Amino acid sequence: FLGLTLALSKGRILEETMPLLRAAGVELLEDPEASRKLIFPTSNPNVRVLILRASDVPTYVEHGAADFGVAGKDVLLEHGANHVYELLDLKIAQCKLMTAGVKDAPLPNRRLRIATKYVNVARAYFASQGQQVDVIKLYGSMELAPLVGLGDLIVDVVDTGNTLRANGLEARDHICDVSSRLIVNQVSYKRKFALLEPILDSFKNSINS
Template identity: 60%
Template sequence: MNITDPITIALTKGRILKETLPLLAKVGIEPSEDLDASRKLIVPTTITNVHLVILRGSDVPTYVKHGAADIGIAGKDMLLEFGGEGIYEPLDLGIARCRLMTAGPRVSQTAQAPRRRIRVATKFLNIARAHYAGKGIHADLIKLYGSMELAPLMG
């Protein structure tokens, strides 16, 4: 890479983007147009050879891993779920904190004890698989894309 080569920064849409822009502004990198008014996915910045690419969080690690972006800012959940292997994670920016939770119907401890298999609906298959395997629990994982809170109610 040459010093005059363009630098592409992949950013995650939504809340992470809103919390990332002030951090970039502190180092002089600002979009040269209003992101709320623009529908562009590749946005020039106030620095000539630096541009931003606005992506889904799950795509940021892939763009960086395959060289389509030089650096990226994504949630830790996205790195763990969608291929953080081979990606250097220099620091936690302390933004857009989230928690992954497990929910299910209330069952008495005695009724639950003999049960060795559970069903888990999740959009984070890899994270859930690692979590339950680490606890010695065999989980049948069901991939969902939304309405996670409805899954335990529906069985």
């Protein structure tokens, strides 16, 4: 495939990216949410879309299996963004990385154990608080961990806070704001700039309003 391959993920990233794509002249020809297919043509024959797990977007873009992609800052921080270029903050799929635990549970006076998917972000954040923590790696449902006593806190993304509230948890610390970012393969940026440029300019214009 000679053109550009764009990496997206299902849910909020797909939904909130599509209007940027539309204004940039790119529209999907069916709903990826309703297909098991993974590669999708678009209204532009030079652009195709990969639908990936959010955690795999940086990986595909880094290796050049996608030329560019839309990834959450949370995923970028966790994966490491040293081998892609972060070109734009798209200001979509906004949320916060936070620490949380059982409401009014006292913290134990010992090395804390942090149940989380975000092991690198947990370690770096807690290091900034003077804290060398243990991490317990999980793949999902962080909110259960404090209810069964797995770790002392979690680190997870919080949007409305409804998940935390539904489970008797409250945010302890705000780590950072998260939004989806446009990332580009370091070589594709150089080799396919004439294809990327009008799309980047459109996105940038769109984000201003």
